[PDB]
mmCIF file of all heavy atoms in Angstrom:
data_model
loop_
_atom_site.group_PDB
_atom_site.id
_atom_site.type_symbol
_atom_site.label_atom_id
_atom_site.label_comp_id
_atom_site.label_asym_id
_atom_site.label_seq_id
_atom_site.Cartn_x
_atom_site.Cartn_y
_atom_site.Cartn_z
ATOM 1 N N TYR A 1 -90.545 35.178 41.718
ATOM 2 C CA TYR A 1 -90.749 36.563 41.392
ATOM 3 C C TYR A 1 -92.143 36.765 40.876
ATOM 4 O O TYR A 1 -92.830 37.741 41.212
ATOM 5 C CB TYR A 1 -89.735 36.998 40.297
ATOM 6 C CG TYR A 1 -89.866 38.449 39.836
ATOM 7 C CD1 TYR A 1 -88.896 39.352 40.183
ATOM 8 C CD2 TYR A 1 -90.924 38.871 39.059
ATOM 9 C CE1 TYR A 1 -88.994 40.637 39.854
ATOM 10 C CE2 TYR A 1 -91.031 40.198 38.694
ATOM 11 C CZ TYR A 1 -90.045 41.091 39.079
ATOM 12 O OH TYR A 1 -90.080 42.431 38.762
ATOM 13 N N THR A 2 -92.550 35.863 39.973
ATOM 14 C CA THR A 2 -93.861 36.015 39.334
ATOM 15 C C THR A 2 -94.950 35.688 40.320
ATOM 16 O O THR A 2 -96.012 36.305 40.361
ATOM 17 C CB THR A 2 -93.912 35.130 38.106
ATOM 18 O OG1 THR A 2 -92.851 35.513 37.232
ATOM 19 C CG2 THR A 2 -95.218 35.309 37.365
ATOM 20 N N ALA A 3 -94.694 34.713 41.166
ATOM 21 C CA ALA A 3 -95.685 34.348 42.180
ATOM 22 C C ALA A 3 -95.970 35.513 43.140
ATOM 23 O O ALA A 3 -97.111 35.861 43.379
ATOM 24 C CB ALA A 3 -95.188 33.131 42.942
ATOM 25 N N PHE A 4 -94.903 36.158 43.638
ATOM 26 C CA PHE A 4 -95.067 37.281 44.564
ATOM 27 C C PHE A 4 -95.778 38.463 43.924
ATOM 28 O O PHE A 4 -96.586 39.122 44.588
ATOM 29 C CB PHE A 4 -93.670 37.656 45.089
ATOM 30 C CG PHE A 4 -93.658 38.659 46.202
ATOM 31 C CD1 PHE A 4 -93.922 38.244 47.507
ATOM 32 C CD2 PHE A 4 -93.361 39.978 45.948
ATOM 33 C CE1 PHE A 4 -93.925 39.180 48.549
ATOM 34 C CE2 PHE A 4 -93.338 40.903 46.948
ATOM 35 C CZ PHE A 4 -93.591 40.515 48.258
ATOM 36 N N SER A 5 -95.410 38.798 42.638
ATOM 37 C CA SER A 5 -96.146 39.853 41.941
ATOM 38 C C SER A 5 -97.634 39.544 41.809
ATOM 39 O O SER A 5 -98.483 40.445 41.933
ATOM 40 C CB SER A 5 -95.547 40.041 40.541
ATOM 41 O OG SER A 5 -94.168 40.286 40.721
ATOM 42 N N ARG A 6 -97.979 38.290 41.549
ATOM 43 C CA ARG A 6 -99.385 37.910 41.494
ATOM 44 C C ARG A 6 -100.022 38.083 42.870
ATOM 45 O O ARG A 6 -101.107 38.654 43.007
ATOM 46 C CB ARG A 6 -99.543 36.452 41.031
ATOM 47 C CG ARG A 6 -100.975 35.983 40.886
ATOM 48 C CD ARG A 6 -101.070 34.521 40.444
ATOM 49 N NE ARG A 6 -100.668 34.334 39.053
ATOM 50 C CZ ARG A 6 -100.340 33.158 38.507
ATOM 51 N NH1 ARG A 6 -100.374 32.047 39.217
ATOM 52 N NH2 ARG A 6 -99.984 33.120 37.203
ATOM 53 N N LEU A 7 -99.341 37.591 43.905
ATOM 54 C CA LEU A 7 -99.900 37.658 45.254
ATOM 55 C C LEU A 7 -100.107 39.100 45.643
ATOM 56 O O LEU A 7 -101.186 39.500 46.049
ATOM 57 C CB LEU A 7 -98.943 36.991 46.228
ATOM 58 C CG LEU A 7 -99.270 37.247 47.720
ATOM 59 C CD1 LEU A 7 -100.647 36.494 47.956
ATOM 60 C CD2 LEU A 7 -98.112 36.769 48.548
ATOM 61 N N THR A 8 -99.102 39.936 45.405
ATOM 62 C CA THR A 8 -99.277 41.307 45.847
ATOM 63 C C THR A 8 -100.286 42.024 44.965
ATOM 64 O O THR A 8 -100.934 42.956 45.423
ATOM 65 C CB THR A 8 -97.947 42.058 45.894
ATOM 66 O OG1 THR A 8 -97.321 42.066 44.610
ATOM 67 C CG2 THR A 8 -96.960 41.452 46.905
ATOM 68 N N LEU A 9 -100.438 41.627 43.694
ATOM 69 C CA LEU A 9 -101.491 42.249 42.886
ATOM 70 C C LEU A 9 -102.879 41.871 43.422
ATOM 71 O O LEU A 9 -103.765 42.709 43.574
ATOM 72 C CB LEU A 9 -101.348 41.830 41.428
ATOM 73 C CG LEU A 9 -102.597 42.074 40.545
ATOM 74 C CD1 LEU A 9 -102.933 43.561 40.533
ATOM 75 C CD2 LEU A 9 -102.404 41.484 39.096
ATOM 76 N N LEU A 10 -103.107 40.588 43.656
ATOM 77 C CA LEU A 10 -104.366 40.142 44.249
ATOM 78 C C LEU A 10 -104.636 40.846 45.572
ATOM 79 O O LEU A 10 -105.752 41.304 45.831
ATOM 80 C CB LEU A 10 -104.277 38.642 44.451
ATOM 81 C CG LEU A 10 -104.377 37.830 43.154
ATOM 82 C CD1 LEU A 10 -103.857 36.460 43.490
ATOM 83 C CD2 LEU A 10 -105.805 37.799 42.616
ATOM 84 N N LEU A 11 -103.627 41.014 46.417
ATOM 85 C CA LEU A 11 -103.890 41.616 47.723
ATOM 86 C C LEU A 11 -104.140 43.107 47.612
ATOM 87 O O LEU A 11 -105.051 43.650 48.258
ATOM 88 C CB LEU A 11 -102.766 41.305 48.685
ATOM 89 C CG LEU A 11 -102.611 39.861 49.090
ATOM 90 C CD1 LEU A 11 -101.412 39.764 50.026
ATOM 91 C CD2 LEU A 11 -103.789 39.295 49.815
ATOM 92 N N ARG A 12 -103.368 43.802 46.781
ATOM 93 C CA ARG A 12 -103.620 45.180 46.491
ATOM 94 C C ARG A 12 -105.072 45.392 46.055
ATOM 95 O O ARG A 12 -105.749 46.320 46.521
ATOM 96 C CB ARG A 12 -102.666 45.682 45.390
ATOM 97 C CG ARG A 12 -102.858 47.144 45.002
ATOM 98 C CD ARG A 12 -102.499 48.071 46.136
ATOM 99 N NE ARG A 12 -101.070 48.015 46.456
ATOM 100 C CZ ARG A 12 -100.553 48.427 47.593
ATOM 101 N NH1 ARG A 12 -101.353 48.888 48.542
ATOM 102 N NH2 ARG A 12 -99.246 48.332 47.804
ATOM 103 N N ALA A 13 -105.551 44.532 45.137
ATOM 104 C CA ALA A 13 -106.922 44.657 44.648
ATOM 105 C C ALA A 13 -107.916 44.454 45.779
ATOM 106 O O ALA A 13 -108.872 45.214 45.944
ATOM 107 C CB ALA A 13 -107.173 43.643 43.519
ATOM 108 N N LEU A 14 -107.697 43.417 46.575
ATOM 109 C CA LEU A 14 -108.610 43.121 47.663
ATOM 110 C C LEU A 14 -108.622 44.239 48.686
ATOM 111 O O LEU A 14 -109.655 44.496 49.314
ATOM 112 C CB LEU A 14 -108.194 41.810 48.344
ATOM 113 C CG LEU A 14 -108.573 40.481 47.674
ATOM 114 C CD1 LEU A 14 -107.874 39.311 48.284
ATOM 115 C CD2 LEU A 14 -110.067 40.221 47.671
ATOM 116 N N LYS A 15 -107.487 44.912 48.859
ATOM 117 C CA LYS A 15 -107.404 46.043 49.762
ATOM 118 C C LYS A 15 -108.150 47.285 49.234
ATOM 119 O O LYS A 15 -108.835 47.960 49.998
ATOM 120 C CB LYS A 15 -105.930 46.387 50.013
ATOM 121 C CG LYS A 15 -105.698 47.415 51.087
ATOM 122 C CD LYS A 15 -104.262 47.360 51.521
ATOM 123 C CE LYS A 15 -103.890 48.482 52.481
ATOM 124 N NZ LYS A 15 -102.653 48.168 53.277
ATOM 125 N N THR A 16 -108.027 47.595 47.937
ATOM 126 C CA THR A 16 -108.608 48.813 47.418
ATOM 127 C C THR A 16 -110.119 48.702 47.252
ATOM 128 O O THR A 16 -110.847 49.691 47.445
ATOM 129 C CB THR A 16 -107.988 49.162 46.059
ATOM 130 O OG1 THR A 16 -106.609 48.779 46.060
ATOM 131 C CG2 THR A 16 -108.093 50.664 45.758
ATOM 132 N N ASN A 17 -110.601 47.493 46.931
ATOM 133 C CA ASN A 17 -112.046 47.269 46.747
ATOM 134 C C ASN A 17 -112.292 45.758 46.896
ATOM 135 O O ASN A 17 -112.387 45.047 45.903
ATOM 136 C CB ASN A 17 -112.527 47.766 45.419
ATOM 137 C CG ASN A 17 -114.035 47.717 45.300
ATOM 138 O OD1 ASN A 17 -114.688 46.870 45.909
ATOM 139 N ND2 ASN A 17 -114.588 48.673 44.557
ATOM 140 N N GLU A 18 -112.506 45.333 48.131
ATOM 141 C CA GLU A 18 -112.659 43.905 48.366
ATOM 142 C C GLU A 18 -113.798 43.312 47.553
ATOM 143 O O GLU A 18 -113.655 42.253 46.922
ATOM 144 C CB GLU A 18 -112.865 43.693 49.867
ATOM 145 C CG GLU A 18 -112.903 42.275 50.343
ATOM 146 C CD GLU A 18 -113.219 42.198 51.829
ATOM 147 O OE1 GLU A 18 -114.017 43.043 52.329
ATOM 148 O OE2 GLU A 18 -112.644 41.316 52.484
ATOM 149 N N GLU A 19 -114.962 43.994 47.559
ATOM 150 C CA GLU A 19 -116.164 43.423 46.958
ATOM 151 C C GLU A 19 -115.948 43.129 45.478
ATOM 152 O O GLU A 19 -116.246 42.026 45.006
ATOM 153 C CB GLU A 19 -117.358 44.376 47.123
ATOM 154 C CG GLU A 19 -118.715 43.717 46.793
ATOM 155 C CD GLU A 19 -119.777 44.689 46.221
ATOM 156 O OE1 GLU A 19 -120.117 45.674 46.893
ATOM 157 O OE2 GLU A 19 -120.282 44.439 45.108
ATOM 158 N N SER A 20 -115.400 44.092 44.746
ATOM 159 C CA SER A 20 -115.085 43.862 43.344
ATOM 160 C C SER A 20 -114.016 42.796 43.197
ATOM 161 O O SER A 20 -114.126 41.913 42.332
ATOM 162 C CB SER A 20 -114.639 45.132 42.660
ATOM 163 O OG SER A 20 -115.779 45.843 42.209
ATOM 164 N N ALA A 21 -112.948 42.883 44.006
ATOM 165 C CA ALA A 21 -111.853 41.924 43.865
ATOM 166 C C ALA A 21 -112.405 40.510 43.995
ATOM 167 O O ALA A 21 -112.120 39.615 43.170
ATOM 168 C CB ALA A 21 -110.773 42.209 44.895
ATOM 169 N N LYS A 22 -113.217 40.296 45.014
ATOM 170 C CA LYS A 22 -113.719 38.951 45.254
ATOM 171 C C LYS A 22 -114.676 38.516 44.177
ATOM 172 O O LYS A 22 -114.683 37.363 43.780
ATOM 173 C CB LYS A 22 -114.379 38.884 46.644
ATOM 174 C CG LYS A 22 -113.361 38.960 47.763
ATOM 175 C CD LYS A 22 -114.052 38.785 49.111
ATOM 176 C CE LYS A 22 -113.135 38.058 50.056
ATOM 177 N NZ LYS A 22 -113.742 37.879 51.385
ATOM 178 N N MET A 23 -115.467 39.450 43.656
ATOM 179 C CA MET A 23 -116.330 39.142 42.524
ATOM 180 C C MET A 23 -115.498 38.568 41.381
ATOM 181 O O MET A 23 -115.796 37.500 40.832
ATOM 182 C CB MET A 23 -117.073 40.397 42.059
ATOM 183 C CG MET A 23 -118.264 40.856 42.933
ATOM 184 S SD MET A 23 -119.005 42.427 42.368
ATOM 185 C CE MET A 23 -119.621 41.946 40.755
ATOM 186 N N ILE A 24 -114.430 39.265 41.022
ATOM 187 C CA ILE A 24 -113.588 38.826 39.914
ATOM 188 C C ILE A 24 -113.093 37.403 40.128
ATOM 189 O O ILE A 24 -113.044 36.603 39.187
ATOM 190 C CB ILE A 24 -112.402 39.773 39.726
ATOM 191 C CG1 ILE A 24 -112.905 41.168 39.392
ATOM 192 C CG2 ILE A 24 -111.472 39.214 38.684
ATOM 193 C CD1 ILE A 24 -111.888 42.244 39.656
ATOM 194 N N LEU A 25 -112.724 37.067 41.350
ATOM 195 C CA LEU A 25 -112.110 35.773 41.622
ATOM 196 C C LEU A 25 -113.087 34.617 41.508
ATOM 197 O O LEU A 25 -112.681 33.493 41.161
ATOM 198 C CB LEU A 25 -111.472 35.806 43.020
ATOM 199 C CG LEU A 25 -110.209 36.649 43.042
ATOM 200 C CD1 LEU A 25 -109.759 36.922 44.455
ATOM 201 C CD2 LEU A 25 -109.007 35.908 42.311
ATOM 202 N N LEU A 26 -114.367 34.840 41.798
ATOM 203 C CA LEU A 26 -115.322 33.756 41.976
ATOM 204 C C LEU A 26 -116.464 33.786 40.961
ATOM 205 O O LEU A 26 -117.211 32.818 40.866
ATOM 206 C CB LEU A 26 -115.923 33.809 43.388
ATOM 207 C CG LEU A 26 -114.999 34.375 44.462
ATOM 208 C CD1 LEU A 26 -115.758 34.629 45.747
ATOM 209 C CD2 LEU A 26 -113.834 33.456 44.743
ATOM 210 N N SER A 27 -116.596 34.876 40.209
ATOM 211 C CA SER A 27 -117.619 34.997 39.181
ATOM 212 C C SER A 27 -117.939 33.663 38.533
ATOM 213 O O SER A 27 -119.087 33.248 38.490
ATOM 214 C CB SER A 27 -117.139 35.992 38.103
ATOM 215 O OG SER A 27 -116.004 35.499 37.393
ATOM 216 N N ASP A 28 -116.926 32.992 38.034
ATOM 217 C CA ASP A 28 -117.134 31.752 37.293
ATOM 218 C C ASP A 28 -117.259 30.603 38.286
ATOM 219 O O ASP A 28 -116.293 30.297 38.992
ATOM 220 C CB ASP A 28 -115.998 31.532 36.317
ATOM 221 C CG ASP A 28 -116.224 30.335 35.443
ATOM 222 O OD1 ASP A 28 -117.019 29.468 35.842
ATOM 223 O OD2 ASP A 28 -115.601 30.270 34.357
ATOM 224 N N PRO A 29 -118.426 29.956 38.397
ATOM 225 C CA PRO A 29 -118.561 28.883 39.387
ATOM 226 C C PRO A 29 -117.871 27.615 38.966
ATOM 227 O O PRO A 29 -117.746 26.699 39.784
ATOM 228 C CB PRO A 29 -120.081 28.683 39.485
ATOM 229 C CG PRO A 29 -120.713 29.733 38.566
ATOM 230 C CD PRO A 29 -119.638 30.116 37.588
ATOM 231 N N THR A 30 -117.435 27.513 37.719
ATOM 232 C CA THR A 30 -116.779 26.309 37.269
ATOM 233 C C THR A 30 -115.310 26.291 37.601
ATOM 234 O O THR A 30 -114.601 25.359 37.226
ATOM 235 C CB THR A 30 -116.915 26.138 35.758
ATOM 236 O OG1 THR A 30 -116.002 27.006 35.093
ATOM 237 C CG2 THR A 30 -118.346 26.440 35.326
ATOM 238 N N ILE A 31 -114.806 27.318 38.283
ATOM 239 C CA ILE A 31 -113.399 27.367 38.689
ATOM 240 C C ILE A 31 -113.403 27.332 40.194
ATOM 241 O O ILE A 31 -113.795 28.325 40.835
ATOM 242 C CB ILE A 31 -112.669 28.592 38.158
ATOM 243 C CG1 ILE A 31 -113.045 28.806 36.701
ATOM 244 C CG2 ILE A 31 -111.154 28.364 38.356
ATOM 245 C CD1 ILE A 31 -112.584 30.127 36.140
ATOM 246 N N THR A 32 -112.965 26.231 40.750
ATOM 247 C CA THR A 32 -113.060 25.941 42.174
ATOM 248 C C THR A 32 -111.699 26.109 42.882
ATOM 249 O O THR A 32 -110.631 26.151 42.268
ATOM 250 C CB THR A 32 -113.615 24.543 42.373
ATOM 251 O OG1 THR A 32 -112.661 23.599 41.874
ATOM 252 C CG2 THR A 32 -114.907 24.359 41.605
ATOM 253 N N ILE A 33 -111.790 26.191 44.193
ATOM 254 C CA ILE A 33 -110.630 26.260 45.067
ATOM 255 C C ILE A 33 -110.439 24.882 45.686
ATOM 256 O O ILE A 33 -111.353 24.368 46.345
ATOM 257 C CB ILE A 33 -110.793 27.318 46.165
ATOM 258 C CG1 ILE A 33 -111.138 28.675 45.572
ATOM 259 C CG2 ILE A 33 -109.523 27.390 47.014
ATOM 260 C CD1 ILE A 33 -111.553 29.611 46.593
#
């Protein structure tokens, strides 16, 4: 339940304003994928 809410929140954000959404995710270079 919590995973899907996170996923849909992240995707909603990326849909409404990709540039800002992606900024938020990667701003910190010490947090890697």
Side-chain angles (χ1 to χ4, degrees):
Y1 179 109
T2 301
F4 188 80
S5 305
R6 182 181 290 163
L7 168 67
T8 59
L9 164 60
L10 287 163
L11 292 179
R12 180 67 66 200
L14 282 168
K15 189 163 173 160
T16 325
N17 188 329
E18 186 185 35
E19 193 210 302
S20 275
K22 288 185 146 178
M23 285 175 64
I24 298 160
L25 287 167
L26 330 169
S27 66
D28 185 338
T30 77
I31 316 169
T32 66
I33 306 169

